[PDB]
Amino acid sequence: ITPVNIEEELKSSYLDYAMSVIVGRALPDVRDGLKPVHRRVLYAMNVLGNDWNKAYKKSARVVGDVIGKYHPHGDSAVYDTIVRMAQPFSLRYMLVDGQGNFGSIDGDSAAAMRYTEIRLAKIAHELMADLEKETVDFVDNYDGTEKIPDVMPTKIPNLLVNGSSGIAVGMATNIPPHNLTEVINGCLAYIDDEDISIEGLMEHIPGPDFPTAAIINGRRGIEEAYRTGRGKVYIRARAEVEVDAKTGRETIIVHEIPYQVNKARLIEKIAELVKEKRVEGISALRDESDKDGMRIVIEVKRDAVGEVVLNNLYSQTQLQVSFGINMVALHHGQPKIMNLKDIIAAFVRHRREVVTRRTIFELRKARDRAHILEALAVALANIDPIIELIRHAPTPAEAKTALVANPWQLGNVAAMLERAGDDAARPEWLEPEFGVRDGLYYLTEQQAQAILDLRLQKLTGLEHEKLLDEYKELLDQIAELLRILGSADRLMEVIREELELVREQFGDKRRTEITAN
Amino acid sequence: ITPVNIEEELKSSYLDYAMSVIVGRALPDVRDGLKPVHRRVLYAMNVLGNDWNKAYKKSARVVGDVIGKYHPHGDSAVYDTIVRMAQPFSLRYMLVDGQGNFGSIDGDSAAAMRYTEIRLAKIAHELMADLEKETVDFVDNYDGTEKIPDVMPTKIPNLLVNGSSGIAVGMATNIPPHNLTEVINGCLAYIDDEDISIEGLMEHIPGPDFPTAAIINGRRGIEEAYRTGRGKVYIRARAEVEVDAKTGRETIIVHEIPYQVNKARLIEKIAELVKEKRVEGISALRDESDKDGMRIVIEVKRDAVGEVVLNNLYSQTQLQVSFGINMVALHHGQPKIMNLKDIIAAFVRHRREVVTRRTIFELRKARDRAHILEALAVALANIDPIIELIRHAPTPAEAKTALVANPWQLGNVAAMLERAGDDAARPEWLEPEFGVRDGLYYLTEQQAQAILDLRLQKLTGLEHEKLLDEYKELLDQIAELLRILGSADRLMEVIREELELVREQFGDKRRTEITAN
Amino acid sequence: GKLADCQERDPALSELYLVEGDSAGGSAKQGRNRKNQAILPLKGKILNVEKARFDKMLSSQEVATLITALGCGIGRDEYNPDKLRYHSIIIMTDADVDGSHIRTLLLTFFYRQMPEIVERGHVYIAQPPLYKVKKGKQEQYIKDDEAMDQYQISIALDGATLHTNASAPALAGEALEKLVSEYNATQKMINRMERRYPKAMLKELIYQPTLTEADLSDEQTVTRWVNALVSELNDKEQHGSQWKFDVHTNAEQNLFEPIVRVRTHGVDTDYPLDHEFITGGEYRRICTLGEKLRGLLEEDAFIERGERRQPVASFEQALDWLVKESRRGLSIQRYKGLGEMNPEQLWETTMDPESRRMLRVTVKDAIAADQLFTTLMGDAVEPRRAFIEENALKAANIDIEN
Amino acid sequence: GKLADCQERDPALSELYLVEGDSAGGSAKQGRNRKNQAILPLKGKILNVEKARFDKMLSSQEVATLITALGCGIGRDEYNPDKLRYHSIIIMTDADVDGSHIRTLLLTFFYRQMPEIVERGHVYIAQPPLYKVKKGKQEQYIKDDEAMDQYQISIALDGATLHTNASAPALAGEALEKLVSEYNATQKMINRMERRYPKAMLKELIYQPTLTEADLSDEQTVTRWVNALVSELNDKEQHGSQWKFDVHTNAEQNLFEPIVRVRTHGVDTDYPLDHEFITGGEYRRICTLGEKLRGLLEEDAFIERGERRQPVASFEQALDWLVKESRRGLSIQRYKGLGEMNPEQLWETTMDPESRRMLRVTVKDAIAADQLFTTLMGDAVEPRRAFIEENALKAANIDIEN
DNA sequence: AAATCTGTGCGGGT
DNA sequence: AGAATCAGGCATAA
DNA sequence: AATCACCCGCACAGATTT
DNA sequence: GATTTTATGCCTGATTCT
Ligand SMILES: CC(C)Oc1c(NC(=O)c2ccc(NC(=O)[C@H](Cc3c[nH]nn3)NC(=O)c3ccc(NC(=O)c4ccc(C#N)cc4)cn3)cn2)ccc(C(=O)Nc2ccc(C(=O)O)cc2)c1O
Ligand SMILES: [Mg+2]
Ligand SMILES: [Mg+2]
Structure with a gap:
């Protein structure tokens, strides 16, 4: 029964909980704007082969696999996380394609796990592009049995595009969505010139762009938020006053509502307000919203004025709301407050790193393949001595030793190697002893083993020409890969081409309208 | 709207339900002694690769897979069925190896699905032995998308050793457990003499053997049950009286209780009986079962004798119980009442059918492999013309046609081809055009394709010898399989060897003791 | 008490549904015509009043709620069929064996406790579909297996199917249809007697x-x-x-x-x-x-399927090929229960007054029905066992051969 | 509700456990000494009394049940520690971050609402194990990660491992153990300075x-x-x-x-x-x-594992090969929570008086504890944020590393 | 003082 | 009249 | 997260009626 | 298939204090 003081236990326990929650649940990552749960869910859905053009799967299967393998937490949290990503009126660009009943704006809730179906969306495959080519680092899961990516090699600026919202211990984060085309234009403008100020950036990015398509009122708050990182904006509903003459009695029609507002609670709140004689001049209220779109009709009293009653609704009801922009994100594993230029610079650096690592991997693979192709061509050039030697071989090992311990005549293939000289395709780890020395090829152990596993089917003419063609194109591929690493300009040109292609594929129009006060 | 008489609708619906339940849920199959739910659960666990020497899997995986794929009913029933097979005190030989809280002998509870783990047991692999060699017939599932076995090709007499219990519409079934070694000895004795009488069988099978190891008090009902199929037995607990001298104190110690009895309910029943003065001579009651064995202690008054109170306990409380043996099972899709000899005969016929089908499948595979090896051996003896022809041809298809075009002289490998027993090693579907003709071999298309995929590694001496060794072994295997199919006496030798091996592997000792009144 | 009442106060144009399960009840509440339709979901299987004592019937929750919903009294000297609510009652149980069992229990309750309601014809039975078939544009619902088989047979001969035997004959529709139907009948005749040969x-x-x-x-x-x-x-x-x-x-x-x-x-x-x-x-x-059915096929024979020809012998394989061609662009779904159907389907398939189909329950003979109820639903095992055995497969082995 | 009481009535030999989760409490209710032990499951996270008001604290469910079970009064003029039931109190929460959070909440409640209970020493903290290792015959529980590393190190060098340099020396244990311990210490020192180099x-x-x-x-x-x-x-x-x-x-x-x-x-x-x-x-x-650790290995060398041999030319390869060999007949189970354990394991690991392991909570200085409670668990965001940032990674930069 | 009547549980299903 | 205090909602965890 | 409150058949205490 | 209350930080409206 060892004693322990209260203060030390309290301090250690609470600091442990606070650090784990700060760097493990709530705040997102600046480089790709995903919390750990989102990254693990996407990786698990990718591993099972749940592509965007294949049959659906039950949500229960995916949730069970995620909980069992990577994420050691409950089931309701993970399923709600999956559900929120599949709703059109929550994210600007959905990451999950769903079939079933995933709730509605009226205030409903999604069905249980064993009734819905899901798969990856087309855009999600852009986030996990080039994942297999050793572009990002891996870390162990909780019990040291699997591997999980540290950060996805994203190709979309996900943080600004989809925003975020989270509550941590001692701090919180809230970032609204944006439009993809504007963000890509801003990124290209930054790449052109690194000394661009906030004024230059705001020309290509006027402001947020919500999914529900309300109106944004005012412009100073947006500038303050982008300059300092904290600000406030006002979202107003799109409403109109229409009168059909005859009796001269007008009506108020509402087509769109602010972001994150329930329609049913709004309508019942208006009903309660008019019940208690707090709003004058409202005779009838009706909801015609179905299928075609959203329409709310308010029929005012005969002697009232539409403008007077309408302007009271914004001040009293929830048709106008206040959104507080507050940017917090993890830079190098510690929280920090960001503004626009920091986010753009971080994204560009991430892309540069990813492209460099991918190019190195491809160069190594090409060199390794060319090494084997050279040996196969040399062996096929002199087939008759090779088979004659093999026929008198007591065992495979003796044949391999005999093949290794002698030179060979290049013959008519050496001319091809005259194009491949200058040590372009020699692997780095290869020693100077091997390879062509004086017009007589030298074989290694691995080349001899590759020769031993040659099929008779490749002795025909067409299979003979295919190897030469493959070698000829591999030389050009290796030259291009070296050229990309040989300078910095080509890297930025490649990045520009990728961004332009993404913009053309996934771009779309604007929804929210910005107006001054 | 169309009228319908009440009598016709009632009769049709109720008869439909009755005929569904009698052959669908309750009664077991005579050959393997498994209800449909047990068969479906075991098959689903087998398909997942959930063997007895690998990591466990969560119960949610198995239950969800079974519900989704094969068994379209509620999940509570399936999970309770899984839990019942994992308890050491319910089945004589457990079929599922569990980890978690699967209940206790008090009949307490079992944890939910997410808090347990399961895998298959070692003995459970004997039921599903030789399932891939086309030994049993498959039928569709409820939506024409999957296949399920109609019966498992069992190797253990599951029905007798594990017993069964079920309730149906208009009839029921109740069969107790048995010992494996005694039943196997009975089967072996039956095989040597098919006219054995029940008195002869009962020498090797004295009677039941429950998991909890009570005492069976009587010997007259067992013979009646084994002779006609209906009977009654009395199960009695194990207890004794001990005296400390000194002041002449007596205590009653209970070690072993009957089958299907709860300890907590028994203790509370005795407590209520002493509290209401219905039992005289009991002072105190205590429980001291801890991790090693069962012990219940009862203290008796000084003016009372242990024997009278003990007999009052036996006659009043649930320490002695009555068990009604009633044997009903499905033979060919109809219920039927059976005795011992019918069950044993059904098991032996099942084994005969399984062994014959397995032998036919093995014979087919051996013939096909020998057919390919003959072509490989013939091709290996004509290396120079083959390589010349392959080199001259421009395309693999033209080379294939050229190879198929002309015959090939056998050469020096003709000694073994002619030593074969005429057409012993010739596949049935092979036409008389091909094969070893008058001094020349004709190649089929598939043989030519096999020749084209030959490696250069096969030209070594050791690889050349290994193919001939394989061919010579295959000839002996084919001869043995033909001999097994030929006579009806070798089959019984095979069956006897298998049964003896099973007895040696899984034999164990007796638990329950039988005594006269 | 899970009862969703309607608006129509007149008890001569209302309806009541006794749905099985909670999911089906929720869907039916979602998709109903709210003016004059009411719902009452049932948790599961209910009490059997034939075996249960009278006192135990009043203590149960399901039957008590049902009695309260109907509005009439229970037992002699209190029952009053005139003061009735919901003049039309619809069962609408699931389409599997368990649904049939629950239907039998409900019929037993209605007949034993409230004979006049059954006799006057206030009890109906609904009949939802089983299969859904889609072919791009033409989609429909098919009930029971026999209708599906008939639909498959008709679709197999949906145009084309001009059988060219030797040089140029043509059954041209009706003859081929009669031959195929008679062959299917003979196949069924073979299947029913398959056990003994x-x-x-x-x-x-x-x-x-x-x-x-x-x-x-x-x-x-x-x-x-x-x-x-x-x-x-x-x-x-x-x-x-x-x-x-x-x-x-x-x-x-x-x-x-x-x-x-x-x-x-x-x-x-x-x-x-x-x-x-x-x-x-x-x-x-x-x-x-x-x-x-003789060797009418010559060395040359083929079926002039729509822009398709399959010259083969062994006409059974030709039938298989025709079936495969028919199923080339056909999609089939089989509902597992009432829950699978969304509210719109439930409204338009069973609950719509102008597109539903139902059956009306009536009593032909009283003494025979009473004897049948006592035999089947009584608490005597032996008569029920004898009755089940008598109508076993031996009675189904009818030697009419037609 | 949710309170399994004990039979002992004297309040000097009773105990009370506060198990986290419903399933863990249900499992614990089975395997416990029913004579003088009680259980009280907690469903999830409980109320924070520092931020909340007195009335809201009284109206809640969990804290009300806890107050009733303890038996003492609540608030000033009614609180009286003399009439205390269950003289010993044990926490026994989960072994992850959320368990520590619930532990902190419970400590806040006990210290703020009942000081004398904490001061007199009626509060204990239980320490369940994390790993279970079986090796056929040997079976034992291991707590946390450090003890697992020590057990792995001991098992790896268990028997044989007579390293041969050139022909046949014999380090024979303790020298090799010292080398391994020193190398692991240096590796740990290196791992915590990757930021700089x-x-x-x-x-x-x-x-x-x-x-x-x-x-x-x-x-x-x-x-x-x-x-x-x-x-x-x-x-x-x-x-x-x-x-x-x-x-x-x-x-x-x-x-x-x-x-x-x-x-x-x-x-x-x-x-x-x-x-x-x-x-x-x-x-x-x-x-x-x-x-x-220079080139001590000569041209020829090998490691003498028990009934095994393998040539080696580096220390890292030898360590990896020994670790791989030692993990042949070893089985490990890792508990994700208290719900993974059957009742017998709970009894023999946490509830048995002769083999459990607990800590007693006491108070050193009252003013420091009060200030710490107010700073952390208060309702002022800025002091808590400043305190967390003070003890962040910047203050974790310890240059000792020893 | 013999003869009916009345509850409880075992294992797969709504 | 204008400060100080009280509730509800947004997204991942017991 | 284990529990609701009924169907089906067989066998045996304890409680009422002839 | 259908069951229930808390932590964590920042914004608002509604309501109570000198
Ligand atoms: C079953 C399903 C979820 O998933 C699967 C699984 N599942 C698993 O493999 C699985 C998942 C999780 C666990 N988890 C654990 O073992 C731990 C153990 C433990 C011990 N101590 N703590 N935790 N538990 C938890 O993590 C945990 C923790 C906390 C929890 N709650 C709370 O804190 C709580 C919440 C709220 C309040 C309040 N107010 C209070 C408390 C809960 N759980 C193990 N196994 C597998 C397969 C499937 C599947 O394929 N189904 C399927 C496919 C197709 C079809 C078809 O064709 O129709 C049909 C079916 C599936 O759906
Ligand atoms: Mg059903
Ligand atoms: Mg946990």
Whole structure:
């Protein structure tokens, strides 16, 4: 029964909980704007082969696999996380394609796990592009049995595009969505010139762009938020006053509502307000919203004025709301407050790193393949001595030793190697002893083993020409890969081409309208 | 709207339900002694690769897979069925190896699905032995998308050793457990003499053997049950009286209780009986079962004798119980009442059918492999013309046609081809055009394709010898399989060897003791 | 109490539904015509009033809630059918065996406790669909397996199917349809009697001619028929089977005792053929069909399917090919229960007054129905067991052969 | 509800457990000494009494049940610790972060609402195990990760492991154990300083000879030293990085630094091994360990594992091979929570009086504890944020590493 | 003082 | 009249 | 997260009626 | 298939204090 003081236990326990929650649940990552749960869910859905053009799967299967393998937490949290990503009126660009009943704006809730179906969306495959080519680092899961990516090699600026919202211990984060085309234009403008100020950036990015398509009122708050990182904006509903003459009695029609507002609670709140004689001049209220779109009709009293009653609704009801922009994100594993230029610079650096690592991997693979192709061509050039030697071989090992311990005549293939000289395709780890020395090829152990596993089917003419063609194109591929690493300009040109292609594929129009006060 | 008489609708619906339940849920199959739910659960666990020497899997995986794929009913029933097979005190030989809280002998509870783990047991692999060699017939599932076995090709007499219990519409079934070694000895004795009488069988099978190891008090009902199929037995607990001298104190110690009895309910029943003065001579009651064995202690008054109170306990409380043996099972899709000899005969016929089908499948595979090896051996003896022809041809298809075009002289490998027993090693579907003709071999298309995929590694001496060794072994295997199919006496030798091996592997000792009144 | 009442106060234009399960109840509440339709979901199987005592009936929750919803009293000296609510009552249970059991329990309750409601015809039974079939544009719902089979047969001959036998004949519709339907009928006739004979023997006897008992004799005539059948069967096998035969005489006719063995060292020792089988009408109709079903296919034969031709023999494989062609662009779904149907489907398939189909319950004879209720739903095991055994598969083995 | 009481009525031999989760409490109710032990499950997270109001605290459910079970009063003028039931109280929460959070909430409740209970020593904290290891016969529980590492180290060097240098010496245990412990300590020291320098740079220095700054001066042998270091690094480099060296004589002792270009495509200015690095004790202990870990292996060598043998030429390969061999007949179970344990394991690990292991909570200084409670669990965001940032990674930068 | 009546549980299903 | 105090909602965890 | 409150058949205490 | 209350930080409206 060892004693322990209260203060030390309290301090250690609470600091442990606070650090784990700060760097493990709530705040997102600046480089790709995903919390750990989102990254693990996407990786698990990718591993099972749940592509965007294949049959659906039950949500229960995916949730069970995620909980069992990577994420050691409950089931309701993970399923709600999956559900929120599949709703059109929550994210600007959905990451999950769903079939079933995933709730509605009226205030409903999604069905249980064993009734819905899901798969990856087309855009999600852009986030996990080039994942297999050793572009990002891996870390162990909780019990040291699997591997999980540290950060996805994203190709979309996900943080600004989809925003975020989270509550941590001692701090919180809230970032609204944006439009993809504007963000890509801003990124290209930054790449052109690194000394661009906030004024230059705001020309290509006027402001947020919500999914529900309300109106944004005012412009100073947006500038303050982008300059300092904290600000406030006002979202107003799109409403109109229409009168059909005859009796001269007008009506108020509402087509769109602010972001994150329930329609049913709004309508019942208006009903309660008019019940208690707090709003004058409202005779009838009706909801015609179905299928075609959203329409709310308010029929005012005969002697009232539409403008007077309408302007009271914004001040009293929830048709106008206040959104507080507050940017917090993890830079190098510690929280920090960001503004626009920091986010753009971080994204560009991430892309540069990813492209460099991918190019190195491809160069190594090409060199390794060319090494084997050279040996196969040399062996096929002199087939008759090779088979004659093999026929008198007591065992495979003796044949391999005999093949290794002698030179060979290049013959008519050496001319091809005259194009491949200058040590372009020699692997780095290869020693100077091997390879062509004086017009007589030298074989290694691995080349001899590759020769031993040659099929008779490749002795025909067409299979003979295919190897030469493959070698000829591999030389050009290796030259291009070296050229990309040989300078910095080509890297930025490649990045520009990728961004332009993404913009053309996934771009779309604007929804929210910005107006001054 | 169309009228319908009440009598016709009632009769049709109720008869439909009755005929569904009698052959669908309750009664077991005579050959393997498994209800449909047990068969479906075991098959689903087998398909997942959930063997007895690998990591466990969560119960949610198995239950969800079974519900989704094969068994379209509620999940509570399936999970309770899984839990019942994992308890050491319910089945004589457990079929599922569990980890978690699967209940206790008090009949307490079992944890939910997410808090347990399961895998298959070692003995459970004997039921599903030789399932891939086309030994049993498959039928569709409820939506024409999957296949399920109609019966498992069992190797253990599951029905007798594990017993069964079920309730149906208009009839029921109740069969107790048995010992494996005694039943196997009975089967072996039956095989040597098919006219054995029940008195002869009962020498090797004295009677039941429950998991909890009570005492069976009587010997007259067992013979009646084994002779006609209906009977009654009395199960009695194990207890004794001990005296400390000194002041002449007596205590009653209970070690072993009957089958299907709860300890907590028994203790509370005795407590209520002493509290209401219905039992005289009991002072105190205590429980001291801890991790090693069962012990219940009862203290008796000084003016009372242990024997009278003990007999009052036996006659009043649930320490002695009555068990009604009633044997009903499905033979060919109809219920039927059976005795011992019918069950044993059904098991032996099942084994005969399984062994014959397995032998036919093995014979087919051996013939096909020998057919390919003959072509490989013939091709290996004509290396120079083959390589010349392959080199001259421009395309693999033209080379294939050229190879198929002309015959090939056998050469020096003709000694073994002619030593074969005429057409012993010739596949049935092979036409008389091909094969070893008058001094020349004709190649089929598939043989030519096999020749084209030959490696250069096969030209070594050791690889050349290994193919001939394989061919010579295959000839002996084919001869043995033909001999097994030929006579009806070798089959019984095979069956006897298998049964003896099973007895040696899984034999164990007796638990329950039988005594006269 | 899970009861969602309607607005219509007049008890002569209202309706009530007794839905099984909670999911179906929620969907029905979602999709109902709210003016004059009410819902009452049932948790599960309910009490059996035939076996239960009267006192226990009042304590239960399900039957008590049902009695309160109906509004009438219960028991003698309080029941009053005049003061009734919801003049029309619809059961609408699931489409599997458990639904039928619950339907029987509800019918027992209504008949034993409230006879006048059943007699006046206030109890209806709904009939939801089972299969859904889609072909791009044309989609529909199909009830029961027989309708699905008939739909498949009709779709198999949906245009085209001009059978070119030798040079250029053409059944052209009705003849082919009659031949196919009669063949399906004969296949069903074979299937119902499949237990007592092997499938191969019955499938091959149609190809053979009639027995020709007129020229039968103890020597040189009895042997030819059995030998021909055995030779035709042995050379058509895929499972290592074997057919053998022997014949005998009993001073009246020369009888056959064919034998067959497969995947077993036992032997049946007899599949006797005598005057009994030839005297049956099953063999007569089989030979009648076989007279039409002969080797009409020449060296050249094909079926002029729509821009498709499959020249082959063994017309069964041609039927298989036609079935495969029919199913090339067909999609089928089979509902597991009422829950799978969304509210719109439930509204438009069963709850719509102008597109639903139902059945009305009526009593033909009273004493017979009372005896049947006592026999089946009583608490006497032996009469129920005897009744179930009497109508077992032995009663289904009807030897009408038609 | 949710309170399984004990039979003992004297309040000096009872105990109370506060199990987290419903399933863990249900499992614990089975395997407990029913004579003088009680259980009280908690469904999830409980109310924070520091922020909340008195009325809301009284209205809640969990705290009300806890107050009723304890039996004392609540608030001023009613609280009286004399009438205390269950003289010993045990927490026994889960073994992850949320368990620690619930523990902190419970401690806040006990200290703020009932000081004398904490001061007199009626509160205990339980410590359930984390790993279970079985090796056929041996079976034992291991707590946390450090003890698992110690058990792994002991098992790896358990029997045999008589390392052979050239022909047949025998280290035989304790010398090898000391070498392994020292190497693991140096590895742990290296792992916690990857921020400042690469891992490979520190790894390479152990094999190379000592820099010997005393006799270096300005001999220009630093050029050869850095050249050899860079050549060794680039010889076995397998990540595409490149290394260069630079030297200068800005002071009496010549200084040098490498320039490394890594996969990121950005190059650090330098990583100078300046005067502080050479004078630091870290480099001295690294050289001390490397002195025994030079090329001690001759041309021929092997490791003498029990009934096994394998040629080796490096210490890391030997350690990895020994670890791989030792993990053959070993089985490990890792508990995700208290719900994974059957009742017998709970009894023999946490509830048995003769083999459990607990901690007693006491108070050192009242004012410090009160200030800490107010700072952390209060309702003022800024002091809590400042306190968390103070003890962040910046204050975790301990230069001792020993 | 013999003869009916009344509850409880075992294992797969709504 | 204008400060100080009280509730509800947004997104991942017991 | 284990529990609701009924169907089906057989066998045996304890409680009422002839 | 259908069951229930808390932590964590920042914004608002509604309501109570000198
Ligand atoms: C079953 C399903 C979820 O998933 C699967 C699984 N599942 C698993 O493999 C699985 C998942 C999780 C676990 N988890 C654990 O073992 C731990 C153990 C433990 C011990 N101590 N703590 N935790 N538990 C938890 O993590 C945990 C923790 C906390 C929890 N709650 C709370 O804190 C709580 C919440 C709220 C309040 C309040 N107010 C209070 C408390 C809960 N759980 C193990 N196994 C597998 C397969 C499937 C599947 O394929 N189904 C399927 C496919 C197709 C079809 C078809 O064709 O129709 C049909 C079916 C599936 O759906
Ligand atoms: Mg159903
Ligand atoms: Mg946990």
